[PDB]
Coordinates of C-alpha atoms in Angstrom, one line a residue:
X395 CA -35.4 29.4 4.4
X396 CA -31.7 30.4 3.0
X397 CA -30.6 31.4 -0.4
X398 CA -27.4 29.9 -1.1
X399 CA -24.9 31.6 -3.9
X400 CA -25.1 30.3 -7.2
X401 CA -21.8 28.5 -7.7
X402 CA -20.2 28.9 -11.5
X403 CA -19.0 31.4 -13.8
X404 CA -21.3 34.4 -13.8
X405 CA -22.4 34.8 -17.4
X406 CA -25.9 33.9 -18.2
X407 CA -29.5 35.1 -17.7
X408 CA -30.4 34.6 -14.0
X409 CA -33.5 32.3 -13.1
X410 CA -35.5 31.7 -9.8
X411 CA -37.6 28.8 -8.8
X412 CA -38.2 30.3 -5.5
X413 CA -39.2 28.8 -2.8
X414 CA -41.5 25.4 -2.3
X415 CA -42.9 22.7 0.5
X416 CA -40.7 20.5 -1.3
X417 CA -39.2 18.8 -4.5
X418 CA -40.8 16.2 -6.4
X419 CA -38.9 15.7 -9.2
X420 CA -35.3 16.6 -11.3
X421 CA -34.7 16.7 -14.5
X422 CA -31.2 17.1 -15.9
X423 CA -30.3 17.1 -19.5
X424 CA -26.5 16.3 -20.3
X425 CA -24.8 19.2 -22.7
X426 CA -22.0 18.1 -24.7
X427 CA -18.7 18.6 -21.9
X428 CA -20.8 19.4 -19.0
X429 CA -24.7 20.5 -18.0
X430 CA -27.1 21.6 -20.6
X431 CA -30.4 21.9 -19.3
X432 CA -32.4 21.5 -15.9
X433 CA -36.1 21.5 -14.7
X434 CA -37.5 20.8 -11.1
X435 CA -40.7 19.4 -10.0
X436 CA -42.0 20.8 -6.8
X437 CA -44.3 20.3 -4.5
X438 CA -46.3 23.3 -2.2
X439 CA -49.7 22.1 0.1
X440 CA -51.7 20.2 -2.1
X441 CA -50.2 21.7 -5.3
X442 CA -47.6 20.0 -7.7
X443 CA -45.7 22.8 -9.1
X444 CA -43.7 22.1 -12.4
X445 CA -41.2 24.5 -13.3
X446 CA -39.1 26.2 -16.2
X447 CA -36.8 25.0 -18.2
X448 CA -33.6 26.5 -17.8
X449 CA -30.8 25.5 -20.7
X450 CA -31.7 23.6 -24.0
X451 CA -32.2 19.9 -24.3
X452 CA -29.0 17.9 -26.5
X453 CA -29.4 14.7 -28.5
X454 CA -28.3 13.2 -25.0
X455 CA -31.6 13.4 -23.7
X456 CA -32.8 14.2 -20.5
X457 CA -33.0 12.0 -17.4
X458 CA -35.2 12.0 -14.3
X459 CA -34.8 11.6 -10.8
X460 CA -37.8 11.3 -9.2
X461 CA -38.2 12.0 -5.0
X462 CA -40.5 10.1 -3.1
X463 CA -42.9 11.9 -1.0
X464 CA -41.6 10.2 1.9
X465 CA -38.7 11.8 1.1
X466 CA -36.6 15.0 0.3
X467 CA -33.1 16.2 -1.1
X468 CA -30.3 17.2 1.6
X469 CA -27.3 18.1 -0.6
X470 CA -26.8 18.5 -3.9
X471 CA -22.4 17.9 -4.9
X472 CA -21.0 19.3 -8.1
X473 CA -18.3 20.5 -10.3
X474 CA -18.0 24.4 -11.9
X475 CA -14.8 24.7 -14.5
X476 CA -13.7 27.1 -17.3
X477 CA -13.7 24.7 -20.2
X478 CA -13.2 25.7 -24.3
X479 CA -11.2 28.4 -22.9
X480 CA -14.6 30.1 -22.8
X481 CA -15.2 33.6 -20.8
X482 CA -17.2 31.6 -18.3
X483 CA -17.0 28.9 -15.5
X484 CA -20.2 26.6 -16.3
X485 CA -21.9 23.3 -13.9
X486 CA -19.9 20.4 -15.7
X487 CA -21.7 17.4 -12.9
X488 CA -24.0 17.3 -10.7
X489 CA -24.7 14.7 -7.7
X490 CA -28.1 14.8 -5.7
X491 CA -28.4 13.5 -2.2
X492 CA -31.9 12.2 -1.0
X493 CA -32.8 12.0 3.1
X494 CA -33.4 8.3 2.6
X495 CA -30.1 8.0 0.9
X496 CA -30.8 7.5 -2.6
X497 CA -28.3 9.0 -4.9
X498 CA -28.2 10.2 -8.3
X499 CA -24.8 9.6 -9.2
X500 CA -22.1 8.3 -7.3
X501 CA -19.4 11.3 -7.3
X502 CA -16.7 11.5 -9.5
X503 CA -13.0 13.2 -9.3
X504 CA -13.8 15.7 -12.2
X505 CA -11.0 18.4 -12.8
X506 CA -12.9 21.6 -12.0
X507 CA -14.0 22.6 -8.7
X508 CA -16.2 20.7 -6.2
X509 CA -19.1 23.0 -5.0
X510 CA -21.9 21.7 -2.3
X511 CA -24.8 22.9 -1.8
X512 CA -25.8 21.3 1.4
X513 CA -27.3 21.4 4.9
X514 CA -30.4 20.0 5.8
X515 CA -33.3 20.0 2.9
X516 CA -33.5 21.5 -0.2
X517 CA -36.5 23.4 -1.0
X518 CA -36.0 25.4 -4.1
X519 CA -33.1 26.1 -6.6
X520 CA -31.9 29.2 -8.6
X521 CA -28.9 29.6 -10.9
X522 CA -27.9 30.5 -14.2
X523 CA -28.0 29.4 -17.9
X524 CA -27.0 30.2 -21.1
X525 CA -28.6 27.9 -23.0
X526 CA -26.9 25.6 -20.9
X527 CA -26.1 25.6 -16.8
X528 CA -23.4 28.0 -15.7
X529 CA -24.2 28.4 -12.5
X530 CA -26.2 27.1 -9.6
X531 CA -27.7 27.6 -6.2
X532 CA -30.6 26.5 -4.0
X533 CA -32.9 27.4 -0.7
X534 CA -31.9 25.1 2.2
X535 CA -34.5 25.0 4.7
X536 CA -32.2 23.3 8.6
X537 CA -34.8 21.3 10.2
X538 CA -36.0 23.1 13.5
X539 CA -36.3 19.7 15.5
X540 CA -33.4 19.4 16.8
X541 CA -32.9 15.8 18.4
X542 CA -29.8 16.3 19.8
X543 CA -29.9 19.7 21.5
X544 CA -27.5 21.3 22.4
X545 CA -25.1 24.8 21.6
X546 CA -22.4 26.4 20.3
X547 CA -19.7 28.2 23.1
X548 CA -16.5 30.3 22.0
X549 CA -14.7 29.0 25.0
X550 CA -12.0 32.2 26.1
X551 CA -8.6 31.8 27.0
X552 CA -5.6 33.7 28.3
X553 CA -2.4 31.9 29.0
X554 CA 0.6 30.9 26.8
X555 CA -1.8 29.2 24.7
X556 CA -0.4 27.0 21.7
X557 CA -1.8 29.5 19.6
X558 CA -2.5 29.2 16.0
X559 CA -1.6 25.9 14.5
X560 CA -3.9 22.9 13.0
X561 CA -2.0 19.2 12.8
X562 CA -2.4 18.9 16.5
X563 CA -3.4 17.0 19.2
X564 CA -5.9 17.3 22.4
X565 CA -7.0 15.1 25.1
X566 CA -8.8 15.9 28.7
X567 CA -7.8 15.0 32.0
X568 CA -9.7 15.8 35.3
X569 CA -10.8 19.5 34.5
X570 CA -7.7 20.3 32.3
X571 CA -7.3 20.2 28.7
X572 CA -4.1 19.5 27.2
X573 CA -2.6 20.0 23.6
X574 CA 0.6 18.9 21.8
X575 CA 2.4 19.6 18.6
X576 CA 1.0 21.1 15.3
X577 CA 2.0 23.2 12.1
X578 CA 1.6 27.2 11.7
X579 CA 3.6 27.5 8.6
X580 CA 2.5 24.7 5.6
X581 CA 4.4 21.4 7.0
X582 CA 6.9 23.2 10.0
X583 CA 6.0 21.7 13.3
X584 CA 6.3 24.2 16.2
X585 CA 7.6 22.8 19.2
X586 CA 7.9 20.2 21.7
X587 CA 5.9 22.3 24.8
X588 CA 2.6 20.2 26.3
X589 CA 0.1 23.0 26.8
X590 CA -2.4 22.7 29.4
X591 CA -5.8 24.9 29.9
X592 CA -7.3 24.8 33.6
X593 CA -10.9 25.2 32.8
X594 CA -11.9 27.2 35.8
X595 CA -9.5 29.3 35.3
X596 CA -10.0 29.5 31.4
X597 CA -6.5 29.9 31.1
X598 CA -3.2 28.4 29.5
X599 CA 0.0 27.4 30.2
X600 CA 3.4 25.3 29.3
X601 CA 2.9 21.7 31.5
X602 CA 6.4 20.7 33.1
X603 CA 7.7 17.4 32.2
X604 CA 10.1 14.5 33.3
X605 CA 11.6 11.9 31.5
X606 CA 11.7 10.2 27.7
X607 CA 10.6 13.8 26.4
X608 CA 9.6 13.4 22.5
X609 CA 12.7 13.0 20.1
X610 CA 11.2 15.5 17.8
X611 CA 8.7 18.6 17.5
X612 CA 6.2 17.3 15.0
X613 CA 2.9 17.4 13.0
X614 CA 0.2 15.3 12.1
X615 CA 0.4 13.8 15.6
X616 CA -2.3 12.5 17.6
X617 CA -3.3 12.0 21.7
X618 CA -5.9 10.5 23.9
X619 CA -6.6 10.0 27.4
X620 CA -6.7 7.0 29.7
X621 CA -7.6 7.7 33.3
X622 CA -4.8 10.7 34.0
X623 CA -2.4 9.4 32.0
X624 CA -2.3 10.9 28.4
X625 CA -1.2 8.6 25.2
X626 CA 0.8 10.0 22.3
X627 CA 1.4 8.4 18.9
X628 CA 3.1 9.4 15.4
X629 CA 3.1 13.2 13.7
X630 CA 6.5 13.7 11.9
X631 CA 9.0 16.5 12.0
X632 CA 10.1 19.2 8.3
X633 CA 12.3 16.0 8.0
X634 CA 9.7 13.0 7.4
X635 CA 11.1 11.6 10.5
X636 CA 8.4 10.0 13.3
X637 CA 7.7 9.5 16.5
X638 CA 7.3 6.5 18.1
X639 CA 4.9 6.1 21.3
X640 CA 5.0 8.3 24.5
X641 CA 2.6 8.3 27.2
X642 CA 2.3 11.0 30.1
X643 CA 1.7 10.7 33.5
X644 CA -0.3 13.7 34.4
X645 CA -0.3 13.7 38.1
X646 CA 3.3 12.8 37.7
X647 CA 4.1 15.1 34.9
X648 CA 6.5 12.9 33.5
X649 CA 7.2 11.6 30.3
X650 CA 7.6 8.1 29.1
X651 CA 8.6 6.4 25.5
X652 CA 6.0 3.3 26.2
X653 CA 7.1 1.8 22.4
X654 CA 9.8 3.0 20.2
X655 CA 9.6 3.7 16.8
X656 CA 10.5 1.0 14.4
X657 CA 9.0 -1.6 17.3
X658 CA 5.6 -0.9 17.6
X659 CA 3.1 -0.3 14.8
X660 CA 4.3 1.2 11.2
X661 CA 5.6 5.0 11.8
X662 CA 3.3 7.5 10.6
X663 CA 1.3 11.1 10.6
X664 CA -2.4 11.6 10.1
X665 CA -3.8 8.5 11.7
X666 CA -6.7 8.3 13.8
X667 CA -7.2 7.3 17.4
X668 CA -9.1 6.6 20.8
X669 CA -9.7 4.6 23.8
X670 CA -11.8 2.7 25.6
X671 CA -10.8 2.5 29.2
X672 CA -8.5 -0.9 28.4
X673 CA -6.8 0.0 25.2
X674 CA -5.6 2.7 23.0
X675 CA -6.5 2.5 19.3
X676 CA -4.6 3.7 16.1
X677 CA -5.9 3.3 12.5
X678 CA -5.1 4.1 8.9
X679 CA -3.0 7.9 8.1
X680 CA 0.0 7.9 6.1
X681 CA 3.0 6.0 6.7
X682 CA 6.2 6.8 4.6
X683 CA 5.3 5.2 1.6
X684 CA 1.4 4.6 1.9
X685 CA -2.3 5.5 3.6
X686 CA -3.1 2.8 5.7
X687 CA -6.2 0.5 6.2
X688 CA -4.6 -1.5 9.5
X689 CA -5.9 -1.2 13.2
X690 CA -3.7 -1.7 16.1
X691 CA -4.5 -1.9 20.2
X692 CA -2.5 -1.3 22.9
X693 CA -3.5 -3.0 26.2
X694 CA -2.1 -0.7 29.2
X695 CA -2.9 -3.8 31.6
X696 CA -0.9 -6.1 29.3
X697 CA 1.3 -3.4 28.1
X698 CA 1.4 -4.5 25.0
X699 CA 0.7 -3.9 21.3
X700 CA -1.8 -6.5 19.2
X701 CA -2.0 -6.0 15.8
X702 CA -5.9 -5.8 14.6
X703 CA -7.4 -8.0 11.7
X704 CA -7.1 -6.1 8.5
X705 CA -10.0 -5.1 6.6
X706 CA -8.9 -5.6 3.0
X707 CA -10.7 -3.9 -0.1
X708 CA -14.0 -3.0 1.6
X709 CA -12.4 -0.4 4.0
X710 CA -9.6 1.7 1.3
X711 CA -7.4 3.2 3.3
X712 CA -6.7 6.2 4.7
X713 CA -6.1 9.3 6.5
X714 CA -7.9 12.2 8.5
X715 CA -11.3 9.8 9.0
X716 CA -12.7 10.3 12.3
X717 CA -12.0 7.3 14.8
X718 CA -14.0 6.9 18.0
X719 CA -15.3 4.2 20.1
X720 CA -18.9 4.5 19.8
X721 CA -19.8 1.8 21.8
X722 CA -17.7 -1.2 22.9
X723 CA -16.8 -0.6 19.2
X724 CA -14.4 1.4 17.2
X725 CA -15.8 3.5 14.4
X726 CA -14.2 4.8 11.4
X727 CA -15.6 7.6 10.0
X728 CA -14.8 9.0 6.5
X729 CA -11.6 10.5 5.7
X730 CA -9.3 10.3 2.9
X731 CA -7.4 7.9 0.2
X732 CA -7.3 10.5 -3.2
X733 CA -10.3 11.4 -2.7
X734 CA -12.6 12.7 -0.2
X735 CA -14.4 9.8 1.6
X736 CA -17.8 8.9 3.1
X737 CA -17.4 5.7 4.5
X738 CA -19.2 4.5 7.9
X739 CA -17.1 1.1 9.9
X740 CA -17.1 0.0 12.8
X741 CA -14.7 -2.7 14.1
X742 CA -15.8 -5.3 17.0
X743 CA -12.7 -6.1 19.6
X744 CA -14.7 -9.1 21.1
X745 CA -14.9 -10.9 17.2
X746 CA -11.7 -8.9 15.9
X747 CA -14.0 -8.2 12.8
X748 CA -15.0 -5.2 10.6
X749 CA -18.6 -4.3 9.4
X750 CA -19.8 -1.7 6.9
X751 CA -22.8 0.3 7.5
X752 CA -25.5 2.4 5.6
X753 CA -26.4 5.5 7.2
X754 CA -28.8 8.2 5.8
X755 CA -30.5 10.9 6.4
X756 CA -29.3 14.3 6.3
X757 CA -26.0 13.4 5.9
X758 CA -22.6 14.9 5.5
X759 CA -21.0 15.2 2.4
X760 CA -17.8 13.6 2.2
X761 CA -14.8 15.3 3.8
X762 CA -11.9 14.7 6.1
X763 CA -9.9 16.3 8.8
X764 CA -12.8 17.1 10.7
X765 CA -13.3 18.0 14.4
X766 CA -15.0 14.9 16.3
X767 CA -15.9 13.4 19.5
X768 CA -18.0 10.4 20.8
X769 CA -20.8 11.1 22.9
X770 CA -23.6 8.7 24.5
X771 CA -24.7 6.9 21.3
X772 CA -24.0 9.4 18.9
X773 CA -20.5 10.9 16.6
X774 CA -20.8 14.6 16.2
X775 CA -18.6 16.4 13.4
X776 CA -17.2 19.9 12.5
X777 CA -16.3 21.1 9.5
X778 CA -13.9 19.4 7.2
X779 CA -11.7 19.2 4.4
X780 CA -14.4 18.9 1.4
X781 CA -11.6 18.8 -1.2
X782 CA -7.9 18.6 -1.7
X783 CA -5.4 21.3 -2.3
X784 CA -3.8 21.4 -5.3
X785 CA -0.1 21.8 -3.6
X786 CA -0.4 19.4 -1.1
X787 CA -1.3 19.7 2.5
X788 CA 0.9 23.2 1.4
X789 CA -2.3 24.8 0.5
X790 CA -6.2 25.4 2.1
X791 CA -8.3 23.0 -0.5
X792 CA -12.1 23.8 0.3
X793 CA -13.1 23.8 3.7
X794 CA -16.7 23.5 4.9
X795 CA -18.9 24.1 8.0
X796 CA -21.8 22.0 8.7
X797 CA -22.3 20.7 12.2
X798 CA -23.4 16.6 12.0
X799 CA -24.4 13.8 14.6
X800 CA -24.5 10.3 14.1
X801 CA -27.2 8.1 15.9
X802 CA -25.2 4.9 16.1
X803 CA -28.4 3.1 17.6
X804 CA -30.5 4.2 14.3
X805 CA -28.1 5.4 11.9
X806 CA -30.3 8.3 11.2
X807 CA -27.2 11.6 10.7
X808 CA -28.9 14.9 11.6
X809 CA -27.6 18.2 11.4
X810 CA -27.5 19.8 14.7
X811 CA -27.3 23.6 13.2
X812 CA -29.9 25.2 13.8
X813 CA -31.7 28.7 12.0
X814 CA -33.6 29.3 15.8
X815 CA -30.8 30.8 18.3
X816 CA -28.5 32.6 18.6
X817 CA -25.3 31.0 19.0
X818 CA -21.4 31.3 18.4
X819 CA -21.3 28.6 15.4
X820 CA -17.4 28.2 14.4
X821 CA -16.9 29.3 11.0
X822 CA -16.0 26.7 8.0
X823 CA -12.2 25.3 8.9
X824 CA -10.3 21.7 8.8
X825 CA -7.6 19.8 10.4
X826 CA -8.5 21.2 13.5
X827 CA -7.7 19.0 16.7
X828 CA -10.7 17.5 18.8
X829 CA -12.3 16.1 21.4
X830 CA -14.8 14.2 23.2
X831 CA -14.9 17.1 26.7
X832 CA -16.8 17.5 29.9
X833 CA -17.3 21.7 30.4
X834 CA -18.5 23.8 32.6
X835 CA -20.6 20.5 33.3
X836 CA -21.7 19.4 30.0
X837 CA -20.2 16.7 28.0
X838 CA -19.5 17.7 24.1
X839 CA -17.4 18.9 21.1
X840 CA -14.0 20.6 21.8
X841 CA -12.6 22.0 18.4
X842 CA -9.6 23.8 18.6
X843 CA -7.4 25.5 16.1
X844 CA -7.0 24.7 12.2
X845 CA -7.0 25.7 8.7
X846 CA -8.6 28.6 7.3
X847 CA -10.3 28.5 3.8
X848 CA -8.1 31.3 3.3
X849 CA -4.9 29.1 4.8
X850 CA -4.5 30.9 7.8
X851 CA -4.3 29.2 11.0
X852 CA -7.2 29.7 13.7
X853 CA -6.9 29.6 17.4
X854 CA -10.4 29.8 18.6
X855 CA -11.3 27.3 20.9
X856 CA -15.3 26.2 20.5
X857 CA -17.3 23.8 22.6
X858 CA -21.0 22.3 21.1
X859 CA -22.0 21.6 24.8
X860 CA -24.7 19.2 24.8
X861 CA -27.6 20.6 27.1
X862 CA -28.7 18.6 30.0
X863 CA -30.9 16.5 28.8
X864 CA -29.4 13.2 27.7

């Protein structure tokens, strides 16, 4: 399969379950501040395999958590820290996962890093223990049948390209992608310009433009298409001022303020949004006092803003959740409020009603500012933020790289990495702006740009291009 590095300080005596069919069985005994002792029960062929101790028990006890056969572990969630002041990091929690979506313990804001050990199924652990848990690892085994197929594509470029930012926005139109706004230095938007990318041509350029130009170069902003015409709404300037909401006529290359600030829905930065051939959708993000739960459509027809029914206490809200309209529905899709979410909601227009649904198997762990598009029946995701920065948006937080679909008809997630090919797979990276794109005759993924683990900016632009079949 994969060994994954042990995650925790590095002082202790190194131990190796190696490698099994599967896991039965975990045992995890409680130490005083964080994790004394573990022991897993495996399962190879027709053999159950129970393995070494690795730690020493406490007066806590020791409690089990028993796999079904039917049924295997996909991520394992934790915490590492320096506590007592002591020479070493050591495993202070520990959440476990399960394909049918049982789980151990619901997560927990600890102080401490969060560590993940995650991708598709866990078959095998390693770490290392002092008498207690200090560190920890574990063999991931990705699932070879892909049900989604499909690959990853380093799209080139060459023109004046927007470059390296993250905080964006991209929409397609026709064979052309365009891009707007963005950060490069921690909360400084760049400029005004509306890049455009002609896809045969693989190259980039600054669009011309008419009319109600945006009031401000901004951030946190966010764009879809409708037909040719592009749709802009919120982001906010190094001043905590907003913008209101533009549209842009792309045959006509002219701007337009369609609603100004302060008269359509609350001003705001790192909402969500989408479309559905009738209306343009923007949820949650972070107004100037709060993160938002509220939903608001904008019929072009009818020109006109309506202002959604709110979801109250079983939907927290939010910012950088995914938001796309799976079918005839919109779907909310994780995010943030404080802490890293893993929510699943979809919203029916017809009603103007919110459900909540259950999803499993191999799912993401929670995480926001993710790349995401809608395509057929499914959500597919990049990436993520898996946990907040210290210093704000100001600094890189822990960024991830797992590549997710969502089978809205089943609600069965798989992860469409794969060990077989080759392929250009985008390295782990956040706030990244993306889309739902047709390319090179292929409908898919179109992540461009964001957040380095090391808080640089990126300015690759990828493509998961769903092969043909569909």
């Amino acid at each position: 399969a994969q060994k994954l590095e042990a995650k925790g300080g590095e002082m202790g005596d190194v131990w190796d379950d190696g490698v099994y069919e599967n896991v039965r069985k975990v045992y995890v005994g409680q130490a005083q501040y964080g994790i004394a002792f573990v022991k897993f029960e495996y399962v190879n062929g027709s053999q159950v395999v129970v393995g070494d101790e690795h730690g020493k028990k406490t007066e806590l006890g020791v409690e089990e958590f028993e796999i079904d056969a039917d049924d295997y572990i996909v991520y394992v969630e934790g915490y590492r820290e320096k506590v007592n002041d002591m020479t070493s990091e050591m495993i202070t929690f520990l959440s476990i996962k399960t394909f049918k979506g049982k789980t151990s313990h619901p997560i927990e804001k600890r102080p401490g890093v969060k560590f993940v050990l995650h991708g598709g199924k866990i078959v095998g652990f390693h770490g290392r223990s002092t008498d207690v848990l200090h560190s920890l690892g574990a063999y991931v085994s990705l699932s070879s049948t892909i049900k989604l197929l499909g690959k990853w594509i380093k799209v080139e470029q060459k023109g004046e390209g927007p470059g390296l930012r993250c905080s964006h926005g991209i929409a397609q139109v026709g064979n052309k992608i365009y891009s707007f706004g963005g950060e490069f230095t921690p909360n400084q938007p760049i400029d005004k310009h509306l890049y455009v990318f002609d896809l045969e041509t693989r190259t980039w350029s600054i669009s011309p433009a008419t009319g109600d130009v945006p009031h401000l170069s901004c951030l946190g902003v966010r764009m879809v298409s409708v037909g040719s015409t592009l749709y802009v709404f919120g982001g906010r300037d190094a001043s905590r001022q907003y913008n209101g909401f533009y549209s842009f006529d792309t045959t006509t290359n002219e701007w337009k303020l369609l609603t100004p600030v302060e008269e359509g829905p609350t001003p705001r930065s790192f909402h969500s949004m989408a479309a559905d051939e009738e209306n343009v959708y923007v949820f949650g993000g972070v107004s100037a006092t709060a993160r938002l739960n509220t939903l608001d459509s904008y019929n072009i027809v009818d020109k006109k803003w309506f202002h959604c029914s709110t979801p109250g206490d079983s939907l927290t809200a939010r910012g950088g959740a995914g938001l796309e309209v799976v079918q005839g529905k919109v779907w909310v899709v994780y995010g943030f409020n404080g802490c890293e979410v893993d929510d699943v909601h979809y919203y029916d227009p017809v009603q103007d009603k919110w459900t909540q649904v259950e999803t499993f198997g191999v799912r993401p762990s929670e995480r926001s500012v993710f790349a995401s598009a809608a395509i057929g029946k499914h959500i597919v995701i990049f990436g993520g933020e898996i946990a907040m920065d210290p210093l704000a948006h100001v600094g890189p937080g822990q960024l991830t790289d797992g590549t997710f679909a969502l089978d809205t008809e089943t609600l069965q997630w798989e992860r469409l990495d794969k060990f077989g090919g080759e392929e250009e797979t985008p390295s782990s990276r956040g706030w990244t702006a993306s889309t739902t794109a047709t390319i090179d005759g292929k409908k898919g993924l179109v992540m461009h740009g964001g957040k380095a683990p090391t808080n640089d900016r990126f300015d690759d632009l990828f493509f998961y291009g769903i092969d043909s079949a569909l």
